[PDB]
Design a protein around this ligand. Structure first.
Ligand SMILES: Cc1cc2nc3c(=O)[nH]c(=O)nc-3n(C[C@H](O)[C@H](O)[C@H](O)COP(=O)(O)OP(=O)(O)OC[C@H]3O[C@@H](n4cnc5c(N)ncnc54)[C@H](O)[C@@H]3O)c2cc1C
Ligand SMILES: O=C(O)CCn1c(=O)oc2cc(Cl)c(Cl)cc21
Length: 455
């Protein structure tokens, strides 16, 4: 009875935790709304590609699924900023090619995980959606496509059913989750760059391409077949304040959109063949930041990944964080004296990191779109670089702590704040680098940042 678990959502987090527990003797039963994606090709995912960073890779590593995943992965050395008039600038993400990110297919990743879970001994049941949960009677309801319902008893319930969690609705009715929604004004549209067009325009095959435009932007991620998947991040509607400013409301036709592209991303528009067809057929996606005070009901049920912390995609960490979570949950469930202790402990350890990543993902928007290279900002950053060379065990860029390290998200954010505070005060009333005493600044770095180890 002790090693029974019912997981809702055969997505990314759900399938990893299904594999991690099943392989350790657990009686895992996974329920998926969708039909089996490695047989039937159903609905469009929230995105085609994903940026696989250390946290995610490492989780897949423990699962012994990392190699299979990286088999069809496209390396991403740094970001390729495209600003008209200025030649494309490549800013590397890290030191060498050891510090990279990977462009992997969502469905491929999902399918690899599904195989992994089923291999470990998990029972995956597709075409079954969670309709409701009776926590008091320790039962739940599922439904097939036809409407026919199915009532199953449960011992422990894991809500790994994504953004619009049926498990979260279920919990919210019997307990105050302490939800706090924060609506993202941007929407998104996925558009394609053919393998022929990517070759013709000699686009860097191993980089994360970005077209910044302040309140709106575009990104491109590489595909194994040399093609690219462009995403447009643009407001849903223009404000009453500025009603002439672009939005998805203004682009009523694929032609209106082709005009906006030739007008605002002119170097991009010719690479985008089928812009009109892709704009009309592929729908406008929604974004949000949902924060809950509570992720669990006693030892009975818990939310993991997107189900517990929906976030904006601007740091490309959502799935990384969701895989990191699955590890933590599996470890707590295996170590704790009982499920109430496990869920209490899991939530208590992940909730603060979940918040910091949500915060940092919002902050990253600005960083890649609204950047604004201020004279004092460029100065701060140069002093920051010196401080990183002089103090590698203390001064680490937040992107590096987030993306390449496995330091808890909240610690990465905390350190970042100490660093940004040092830089601001050090530059203060200085025009250039020659004015500041580097040795004095370095002493402060040692006084405010305790060292970090890879051991
Ligand atoms: C455009 C975009 C790009 C992104 N890019 C990145 C990136 O580069 N890197 C990154 O780390 N993150 C990225 N993210 C975030 C990432 O998509 C998510 O964080 C991640 O998919 C969450 O995984 P999950 O397992 O919790 O849920 P999901 O992967 O969303 O899986 C949930 C599963 O639950 C199922 N389900 C739902 N309701 C029910 C129900 N009632 N009953 C049964 N099954 C149900 C669904 O069918 C699905 O299989 C991106 C997000 C967006 C919006
Ligand atoms: O700061 C940067 O250069 C980009 C951040 N980023 C990432 O690493 O993977 C991502 C994936 C997506 Cl979908 C987005 Cl919007 C940003 C990122």
């Amino acid at each position: 009875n002790a090693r029974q678990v019912t997981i809702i959502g055969a997505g990314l987090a759900g399938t990893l935790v299904a594999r991690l527990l099943a392989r350790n003797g657990w009686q895992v039963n996974l329920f998926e709304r969708r039909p089996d994606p490695r047989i039937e090709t159903g609905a469009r995912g929230r995105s085609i590609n994903l940026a696989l960073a250390e946290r995610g890779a490492h989780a897949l590593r423990l699962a012994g699924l990392e190699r299979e995943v990286l088999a069809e992965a496209v390396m991403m050395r740094g970001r390729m900023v495209h600003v008209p008039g200025t030649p494309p600038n490549l800013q590397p993400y890290g030191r060498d090619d050891s510090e990279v990110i990977w462009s992997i297919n969502r469905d491929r990743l999902n399918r690899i995980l599904l195989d992994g879970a089923e291999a470990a001994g998990a029972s995956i049941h597709f075409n079954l959606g969670l309709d409701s949960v009776d926590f008091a009677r320790q039962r739940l309801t599922l439904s097939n496509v036809s409407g026919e319902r199915l009532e199953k008893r449960f011992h422990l319930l894991i809500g790994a059913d994504g953004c619009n969690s049926a498990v979260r609705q279920a919990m919210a009715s019997v307990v105050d989750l302490g939800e706090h929604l924060e609506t993202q004004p941007h929407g998104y549209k996925e558009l394609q760059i053919t393998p022929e067009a990517s070759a013709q325009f000699n686009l860097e095959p191993n980089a994360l391409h970005i077209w910044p435009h302040g309140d709106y932007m575009c990104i491109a991620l590489p595909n194994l077949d040399r093609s690219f998947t462009v995403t447009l991040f643009l407001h849903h509607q223009s404000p009453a304040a500025q009603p002439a400013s672009p939005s998805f409301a203004q682009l009523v036709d694929g032609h209106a959109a082709r005009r906006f592209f030739q007008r605002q991303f002119p170097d991009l528009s010719p690479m985008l063949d089928s812009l009109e067809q892709d704009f009309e057929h592929h729908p406008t996606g929604k974004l949000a930041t949902l924060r809950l005070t509570t992720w669990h009901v006693g030892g009975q049920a818990v939310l993991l990944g997107d189900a517990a912390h929906p976030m904006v995609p601007f740091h490309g960490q959502g799935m990384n964080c969701a895989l990191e979570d699955a590890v933590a949950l599996a470890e707590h469930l295996q170590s704790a004296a009982d499920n109430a202790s496990a869920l209490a402990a899991f939530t208590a350890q992940r909730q603060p990191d979940a918040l910091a990543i949500q915060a940092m993902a919002l902050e990253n928007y600005v960083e890649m779109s609204s950047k604004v290279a201020s004279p004092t900002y460029l100065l701060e950053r140069e002093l920051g670089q010196i401080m990183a060379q002089r103090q590698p065990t203390r001064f680490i860029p937040r992107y590096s702590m987030v993306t390449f390290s496995r330091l808890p998200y909240a610690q990465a954010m905390a350190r970042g704040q100490i660093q940004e505070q040092l830089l601001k005060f050090a530059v203060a009333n200085h025009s250039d680098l020659t004015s500041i005493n580097l040795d004095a600044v370095e002493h402060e770095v040692t006084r405010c940042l305790p060292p970090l180890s890879h051991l």
